[PDB]
Design a protein around this ligand. Structure first.
Ligand SMILES: NC(=O)c1ccc[n+]([C@@H]2O[C@H](COP(=O)([O-])OP(=O)(O)OC[C@H]3O[C@@H](n4cnc5c(N)ncnc54)[C@H](OP(=O)(O)O)[C@@H]3O)[C@@H](O)[C@H]2O)c1
Ligand SMILES: NC(=O)c1ccc[n+]([C@@H]2O[C@H](COP(=O)([O-])OP(=O)(O)OC[C@H]3O[C@@H](n4cnc5c(N)ncnc54)[C@H](OP(=O)(O)O)[C@@H]3O)[C@@H](O)[C@H]2O)c1
Ligand SMILES: NC(=O)c1ccc[n+]([C@@H]2O[C@H](COP(=O)([O-])OP(=O)(O)OC[C@H]3O[C@@H](n4cnc5c(N)ncnc54)[C@H](OP(=O)(O)O)[C@@H]3O)[C@@H](O)[C@H]2O)c1
Ligand SMILES: NC(=O)c1ccc[n+]([C@@H]2O[C@H](COP(=O)([O-])OP(=O)(O)OC[C@H]3O[C@@H](n4cnc5c(N)ncnc54)[C@H](OP(=O)(O)O)[C@@H]3O)[C@@H](O)[C@H]2O)c1
Lengths: 405, 405, 405, 405
């Protein structure tokens, strides 16, 4: 009926309001994430066919929104405008839990359904998909809430039907909103790239074990009987990894060989580098209690760590990477790679199927979403300021929207 | 009966001589490959259990022997001595065709059998193999004739039984000896790494198409209905690739972006680099006749070419590499790798199964071993001098031993 | 513009007529296929979104239409009516070549495009598909032209976009229309069920080698270097299989153990049965020239042949079956199946991807569609009468519609 | 030193006695398992190369020994004699836990090592294995203790090195001896046949859930997040399945359609049969709480149950079977199999790798071996008499040999 509802409120189920509250970034306030976000009123986008409107109960936090709020080196608002967009703002957020509130044509999902979203859109009619491509790898794939405007930091969100998954009942709205992009991504890294998937007895090296990705990965690895070794930068983060089921941890502050690889011709430099990697390898042996290499290395740290990751992975093993926190130069020593027949695999979010499987595991209580802290809607900036300053807590964080839980 | 037979001759079938002619490298004559090899008399190693003695009819040529003959940067003779070896020489060669002449205990292979060898040894009792590892990827794997002494540049060779494959009848001894390490390696690159194996309609980028690896790869790709695009450095090498079934070719001399990747932070440098890679990508489009990316990139060229290879491979595609001709720094732009979910796969020689399958294809006449030139036994040095000076002909080369064909 | 065009004619490109000529079955004339089909005028169905209208140039022939024309044991017209259909007729045909003539909304395919169709429809929005199911295996899958009315025996046909594949240029309209369901189905059987796909050196047993399925299968197997052994019921059909690249053939008339398996408790009966299967196995050895079992058995013959097929398949081999010509009781001796760890795989038509790959192979001239005979539009009945009476020629047959080639 | 040691005793570690106590079957006492076994003194077989002598601490029980003790329909003693064996007795047992006591040449395993054995032997030099065959599927594979004499019902046992796996520390000798053939076999059924392996959210139908196979399977399925539905013949067996993590159970006594399939031509019979299978399918829906089919059906029951299993499995699902308790006629309705593209997979024991993985899961406490009852060495007959009379308890049973735990 009405055009605008305050946070926590909604029109009659099955109907959409004309407007809504959402947290916007604008070019004029690019900068500190704490200054970048402001709550405004905006029009609610239309609910086209195959789509549904979700009453957003809580939204997750991530790195993407930090870079969006900075503007550098990519003005996402300006980028979209150069692609035909008329918005002079950006609504971020690429995780949510909520309630289907209205649906478009062709949709089978009924108003009232409780859902968690995988923030990936693709064209279900795309030729590569129709010929057997995994949609998240399709040419038409893009991250909702980051590459596309009108993400989850909004009272309502329009999504495609295939993007929805059943909210695990036992979870709070906040916890149900914090895990999907992080957990699903880790799940794909570990179980999505046959034949290099974690098996019982497999040692796994997990960079940033106390982080969002790593928190889920440690659990996933221990769950199927693998042996998780975590990399941390503090004793407390180490203990947290032990809480999650880690065999043990390695403190990266012990080493100084991190970074780009020298010219493989620079013999002196390489030997010096090798000493660093071997020392790291020793620690790994000491944590594991045996002289084995990780069959799989979970990467995302990128430039500083990739050369070590390549060295560490077992013969016929895999380094699988979904990001580049410390930079995008992945320097590979090809001798390690080809002679031992190792795999460096790029990975990015997850498939619908994988989103569903990890949701089931969490629903059943096998995996914990690791909700570390919940923020209010006016604290979206604060929360992203934490990440930016690398002051965020271990695990995953969330933001209440229409919910009180 | 007798202790020594001249080249072309042999004791009674089923028996081993005490000595033999072979082509040796010695530390005192490390250097120019043409000076490095000399024919000498040496003791014939014992034929232990599981092993067989082969009367060597012809032996193949490769890069390994060139580096062995140079001594730098790895004194293979000194290396082996530090591992307990008593030889003060090195007999190279990692390809042969020949006749089983005597067999050890447990061997089912009968004297008289005509064989081609895959020059890879491993421990059939190794725990990783017994637990399902692919033997060529095992911790106990090593290249016979390069990492191990007493290779194929000898009148007789002792090999393990599992190393033998039926010589294709229709082939000369020279042709049957030239293909295995090269063809089998290319076959594994293209068909050994599911799910990234060449399918009908798949475009494939093949570096060094006119070389040994590339010659086989072009044929293999066209055979299963794929679309081979070759990279060459001359018009004549381009035409040769067309002879083999290539859609077309790209001349690498057209470009100057080759080499290590700049810091991904060096924006100017990267854009300049990207211009180079995009120009290369244009040529590829023009050869293919359509705007598609290679699903698989066959690599081996290494440092100069890997960044381009990474850029070129399709979403969810694979770059598979078995060497580093131009250097061992494989610089990866992680954004290309993770966002498009690409695979960089190390590959090294082949499995027994793969050696057999490519042998069958050649036996049936589907694939040509591309024997380019045959040398006499005293020309082993000359032939390796050619490779060293990059003056060798397209395709694969061989050396007569006991044979006249 | 106009409402009706005679065969061979069409409205302006991009437009649809209101009516068309098509060949109908009606309940009142169920029976002999030669009496069952009659050419009538009918309304042209609407071209909804995602769909396109095709000017049908030629249509393929198959078993399905024979059973449709008989009415027994399934009145397809009555069946559909019980599912809400208002038609009192049935237009069959599940293969066509033709020209896109008009398109619905969301379609990227342009009028003028020449296409071959895979006669399988599914719901691209189905949850099982979205969660990673192969669409042809989906709960919403069905054969266009058989389970659905308005198949290809019509001047125009409405299809879904994903159903279209590029017509191979070098083919006549008749040849381009005859192969898809048959070739694609065989292709899936042989290459669609990893890890049991044909590899170089693999012997393959192919029932009905001179038929449509078998004609393509023999070629596909020989193409990747496998060894095709064909089963036929006549010397001439044997020679035809030799034409296609078969190693040799087996004459099934030599044996009398065909049919359902006796109770495995009936020792006498089973030994008698085993004698039959062993004799068949001997012939297979004699054709192959060695004592090996087929790694893959291409089935479709069904009840009479399945017990033999199960016995014949190699340890860890596969029997893959897409039909039951002689009946639907597939009697398995579980001892053969479990002790040798064999796979009995059901298979049905093909995926879009597989339709495309086999089309590419045919386009490139690696595979011949084996067009055996072409009929005129008024001979649809005659052609199906042949199949019914088992008097049809080897290979695949087609029917001209708007075309003269 | 000495030639014979009483049960519980042994020569100096590293040495073998000339004789030993073992439980023998002899032809003269074929019949009731309780009469068939008698403890005698026998020579200890030699410890050839690659082999090790194990001081047997406990041995597992199974079906095989029951059929061995009956003699019908296969005189295993006479069979072996016709293959050249000189023994006039048979020592059964195909599971053990124990201590490596002496080793042959080439063995790396050291005296003192605690081991569990996978009772499968194969020729590590076999050509099919060397060309990539899974050894348990090899032509040279056979079950130690059943197809071969001198199994585990003996004070000492000679095994091949590859057959040994680390005993899980936390287990009693009895528990460590009872699980391997049963657990490993179930593990292969569920995780060994890609792409049909249990995934999170997968419903799985498990015949005989309270038995040895089923006990492990229920746990394995629930462990990876699947949904186990058990088939039992009593309320108490149902509750036991609930103990193991089952969603629920089905009572097979409710149905009477069990057995061989009628002729698919016998319409009346088939409809009657279908009513039975649909009723079974209803119960499955009611247990699951939703209208889904099992993605995987764990079979072994055989003739009575296979037709139902085939009907039940999901589109593109798998029925995997490792036995035929109720008979060896696996009657398949091919229409269900091909139209829904289902897989009927034979499976038999396990690979070394799989034995190791399930051992790791049990070692870590994720899976319980379900030791139901332990017998003394003179009760081997009694225990097998139970199985024979179908009076054995749920789970797995074991027999003490040299151990008191
Ligand atoms: N779909 C996708 O592509 C996807 C999905 C999720 C995440 N990601 C990416 O993956 C990365 C991690 O995400 P996240 O959510 O886990 O972030 P997070 O919660 O902050 O965890 C990242 C962890 O990385 C470790 N780290 C930071 N700098 C490092 C260095 N120089 N060397 C080694 N380790 C270092 C830190 O732990 P310690 O200080 O304890 O070592 C940090 O906690 C981000 O770059 C993110 O953008 C991508
Ligand atoms: N088991 C194994 O690991 C294995 C097996 C076989 C080969 N390999 C390795 O693979 C590499 C190629 O072997 P091959 O036998 O094919 O040697 P080859 O016959 O000499 O072919 C190599 C080709 O690489 C191309 N190339 C050279 N420099 C290049 C550059 N800077 N950029 C781009 N392309 C360049 C050349 O062709 P154009 O000048 O026409 O471009 C050359 O013909 C060698 O490094 C070898 O050691 C490894
Ligand atoms: N998508 C699908 O599910 C799909 C697709 C294509 C075909 N199919 C089915 O596959 C079957 C074959 O199709 P098709 O197009 O190849 O038909 P086809 O051209 O008639 O070939 C079938 C061949 O089967 C052989 N055959 C007949 N009776 C036999 C018996 N009692 N024992 C052994 N062999 C016998 C015959 O050859 P000989 O007399 O020379 O032995 C006959 O030529 C049909 O039942 C069809 O419905 C299914
Ligand atoms: N490597 C191998 O090939 C391998 C390994 C292990 C087992 N097996 C075979 O698998 C089968 C089961 O072994 P197991 O150790 O689990 O034996 P088990 O412990 O006795 O369990 C078998 C269960 O099957 C069920 N069953 C019996 N008759 C049935 C019928 N007519 N219909 C449906 N279900 C029935 C029974 O449970 P309810 O009465 O509660 O239904 C019984 O408890 C045996 O035939 C065995 O030889 C083979």
């Amino acid at each position: 009926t009405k055009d605008l509802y305050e946070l926590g409120d909604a029109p009659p189920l099955g109907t959409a309001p004309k407007q809504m509250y959402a947290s916007l970034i604008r070019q004029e306030r690019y900068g500190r994430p704490v200054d970048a976000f402001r709550t405004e009123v905006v029009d609610v986008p239309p609910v086209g066919p195959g789509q549904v409107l979700v009453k957003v109960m809580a939204a997750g936090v991530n790195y993407n929104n930090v870079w969006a709020a900075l503007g550098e080196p990519l003005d996402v608002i300006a980028a979209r405008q150069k692609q035909g967009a008329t918005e002079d703002f950006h609504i971020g957020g690429s995780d949510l839990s909520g309630i289907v509130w209205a649906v478009g044509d062709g949709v089978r999902l009924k108003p009232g359904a409780e859902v968690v979203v995988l923030a990936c859109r693709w064209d279900e009619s795309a030729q590569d998909i129709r010929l057997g491509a995994d949609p998240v790898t399709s040419s038409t794939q893009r991250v909702w809430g980051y590459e596309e405007n009108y993400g989850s930091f909004a009272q309502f969100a329009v999504v495609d039907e295939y993007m929805c998954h059943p909210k695990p009942q036992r979870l709070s709205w906040a916890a149900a909103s914090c895990y999907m992009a992080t957990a699903a991504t880790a799940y794909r890294q570990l179980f999505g790239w046959e034949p290099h998937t974690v098996r019982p007895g497999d040692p796994v090296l997990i960079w940033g074990g106390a982080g969002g990705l790593g928190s889920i990965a440690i659990q996933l690895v221990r769950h199927v009987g693998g042996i998780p070794v975590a990399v941390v930068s503090s004793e407390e983060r180490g203990e947290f990894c032990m809480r999650l089921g880690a065999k043990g941890w390695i403190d990266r502050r012990e080493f100084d060989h991190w970074g780009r690889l020298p010219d493989t011709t620079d013999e002196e430099a390489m030997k010096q580098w090798l000493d660093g990697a071997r020392a790291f390898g020793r620690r790994f042996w000491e944590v594991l209690g045996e002289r084995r290499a990780p069959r799989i290395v979970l990467e995302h740290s990128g430039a500083d760590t990739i050369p070590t990751s390549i060295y560490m992975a077992d013969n016929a093993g895999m380094v699988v990477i979904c990001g580049g926190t410390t930079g995008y130069n992945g320097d590979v020593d090809l001798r390690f790679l080809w002679m031992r027949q190792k795999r460096l695999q790029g990975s990015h979010v997850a498939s619908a199927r994988e989103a569903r499987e990890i949701t089931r595991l969490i629903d059943q209580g096998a995996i914990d979403p690791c909700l570390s802290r919940t923020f209010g809607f006016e604290e979206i900036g604060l929360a992203h300021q934490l990440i930016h300053d690398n002051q965020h807590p271990s695990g995953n964080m969330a933001v209440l929207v229409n919910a009180t839980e």
